[PDB]
């Protein structure tokens, strides 16, 4: 399945046309079954060839010489695909050589707000169709949310560092053109409670068993009974466990006493058999005396199978009797669960749901209970893998060959029906300005700047209505990493991840993962949740030294040596970013991030968005900021360049 898998490396199906193709190519998608067949085999064949070696550029004479019969006599079909592919970033994306040099003559002029991944992606695509563009970035790098620190052998990122399953990601095809060395992350993550004692692989498995269950619950309550509104207000997710939680704790209360009226019924049956058995000895003693008084011969006789009778009655209880302390010694013994989760369990609970934290950068209590997971359908399969060599080569590589214009300010984006003017400041002299004019204006700004009051960068006309109201709809999270460079490895070499567990709730999410990622000697520690924004109020000194508290519990002081060098993300405070990365927040859905990739059109679209927080289907990863990057780059060839 080559040209199978080529479709399938490419999010594309390979034996059916997506509405996509089936707009461009209306005359196939409505013809002759027989030449949709076609079509797809040299989509699939030409992808194949691209992906087979994404390290020169694919062009429309070489797809053609290498297409076998009949395919290869169809030339303006193969041309129509091939540039088709092209177009829509699928082929020639990245980093190539290029066999077919760029024309002097550069048509259009589109200038792109900030140089990350996304931006950078676009930037290359408007470059290699001849436009003429410039990326305008406020910060003195490249890479925006892509931050990596590289001093002597030491690497550590700052930023995202998780590349998520090759099968279907674009990244992989980049990965192949930077070299950039992926390590998949083993498994293993050994939890440690607040006291520094691991946590026996049975709880592990169990607390986690139940955190799953949990989050099944809440997703049956919400797609399957609709519990997604209460009071009016949307229902967080959360807001589901939390309740979720409740009812768990019900039913063993419930359990625990349908088992003490169990016990009691048996206890009170005892002491009322207990009691007509001491009347029945009574009974019995008024016999064992009397019973011994010349018509004996049969006066005893009558005497003794009488006496006797009262015995194969009583002696016959005792029996009904040890049927009873059987029943009940066997009950107060086999006890129900005393509570649903004990205290220590509830805190390992805790650590799986900061952990979830983690992956949405944010409070559970704002995720939406129905959407947070909109985009569970796009997964790419595959083992995820860390940057061993820092995600920064990605877009280092790709900023190679374009007109960036470091610490450079975006301060006010004009846009009238004949052209866009983009006024930025030099963040070194913030006397001086710029006023760059383009026809188009690529706005990459991170969804956190967006939503910035007072507003960071001024649009002249206002944005519409419809677009500020997702921007303030949508949510944007936070996450933070610490990074702790020491001379030596005092942890795991095997271990890639380690766990702690927090004491509180609501500090669940302070250092709670561990990251043993690279070739020096460094660990990553992780602030999640509401510790995020918290944490960032405290100096690095004191941020540290909890860090070391920590390890020092993990694996005892002494053992653990002072840090050479640290680093401290505080991405909320980071103006030039606000927060991590966004999340479908409880009252939003996924449609709002199909909205933001919206163009902006005061006769012609002029201005046009992109980065995670745009791309509806691969939302907040460098994946999808690559990708809504290729979108629009596409999206404005058409509309400048309009058909090759």
């Not at 509104?229 to 229902?235: A, D, F, H, Q, T």
């Not at 002299?429 to 690529?442: N, R």
């Not at 999410?509 to 690279?518: A, D, K, P, T, V």
Request: include cysteine; glycine fraction near 6%.
């Amino acid at each position: 399945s080559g040209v199978e898998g080529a479709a399938f490396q490419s999010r594309l199906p390979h034996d059916r046309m997506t509405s996509q193709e089936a707009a461009c190519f209306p005359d196939i998608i409505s013809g002759p079954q027989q030449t949709q067949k076609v079509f797809l085999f040299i989509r699939n064949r030409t992808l194949q060839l691209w992906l087979d070696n994404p390290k020169i550029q694919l062009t429309f004479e070489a797809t053609l010489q290498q297409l076998e019969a009949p395919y290869n006599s169809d030339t303006v079909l193969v041309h129509r695909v091939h540039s088709y592919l092209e177009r829509h970033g699928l082929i020639n994306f990245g980093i190539y050589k290029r066999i077919k040099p760029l024309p002097t003559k550069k048509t259009g002029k589109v200038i792109i707000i900030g140089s990350g991944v996304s931006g950078l992606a676009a930037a290359r695509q408007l470059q290699s169709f001849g436009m003429d563009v410039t990326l305008l970035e406020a910060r003195d790098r490249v890479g925006g949310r892509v931050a990596t620190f590289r001093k002597g052998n030491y690497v550590a990122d700052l930023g995202a560092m998780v590349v998520t399953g090759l099968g279907g990601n674009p990244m992989a095809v980049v990965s192949k053109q930077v070299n950039m060395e992926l390590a998949k992350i083993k498994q293993k993550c050994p939890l440690y409670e607040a006291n520094g004692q691991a946590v026996p692989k049975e709880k592990d498995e169990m607390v986690e068993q139940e955190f799953n269950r949990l989050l099944e619950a809440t997703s049956y309550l919400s797609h399957q009974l609709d519990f997604n509104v209460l009071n009016n207000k949307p229902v967080s997710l959360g807001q589901a466990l939390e309740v979720v939680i409740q009812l768990q704790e019900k039913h063993v209360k419930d359990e625990q006493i349908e088992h003490w009226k169990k016990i009691v019924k048996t206890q009170e049956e005892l002491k009322e058999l207990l009691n007509k058995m001491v009347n029945l000895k009574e009974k019995i003693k008024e016999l064992h005396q009397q019973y011994k008084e010349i018509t004996a011969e049969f006066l005893v006789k009558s005497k003794h199978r009488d006496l006797t009778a009262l015995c194969k009655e009583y002696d016959e209880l005792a029996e009904t009797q040890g049927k009873l302390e059987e029943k009940l010694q066997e009950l107060e013994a086999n006890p129900p669960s005393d509570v649903y989760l004990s205290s220590r369990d509830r805190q390992i609970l805790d650590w799986h749901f900061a952990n979830l934290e983690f992956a949405n950068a944010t409070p559970l209590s704002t995720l939406s209970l129905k959407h947070w997971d909109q985009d569970d359908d796009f997964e790419f399969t595959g083992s995820h893998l860390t940057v061993r060599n820092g995600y920064s080569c990605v877009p280092v590589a790709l900023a190679e060959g374009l007109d960036i214009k470091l610490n450079t300010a975006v301060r006010q984006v004009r846009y009238t029906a004949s052209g866009c003017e983009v006024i930025a400041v030099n963040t070194r002299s913030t006397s001086q300005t710029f006023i760059y004019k383009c026809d188009a204006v690529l706005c990459t700004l991170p969804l956190g700047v967006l939503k910035q009051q007072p507003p960071a960068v001024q649009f002249v006309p206002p944005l519409p209505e419809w677009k500020t109201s997702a921007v303030q709809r949508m949510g944007f999270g936070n996450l933070n990493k610490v990074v702790l460079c020491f001379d030596r490895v005092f942890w795991d070499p095997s271990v890639n991840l380690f766990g702690h567990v927090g004491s509180t709730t609501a500090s669940r999410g302070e250092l709670f993962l561990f990251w043993n990622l690279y070739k020096a000697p460094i660990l990553l520690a992780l602030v999640a949740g509401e510790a995020a924004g918290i944490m960032e109020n405290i100096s690095d000194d004191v941020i540290v030294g909890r860090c070391l508290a920590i390890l020092k519990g993990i694996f005892g002081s002494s053992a653990v040596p002072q840090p050479k060098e640290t680093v401290v993300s505080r991405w909320r405070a980071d103006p030039w970013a606000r927060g991590s990365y966004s999340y479908v927040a409880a009252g939003s859905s996924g449609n709002d991030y199909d909205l933001m990739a919206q163009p902006i059109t005061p006769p012609i679209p002029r201005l046009f968005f992109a980065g995670e927080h745009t791309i509806r289907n691969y939302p907040a990863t460098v994946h999808g900021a690559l990708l809504s990057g290729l979108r629009e780059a596409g999206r404005i060839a058409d509309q400048f360049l309009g058909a090759m």
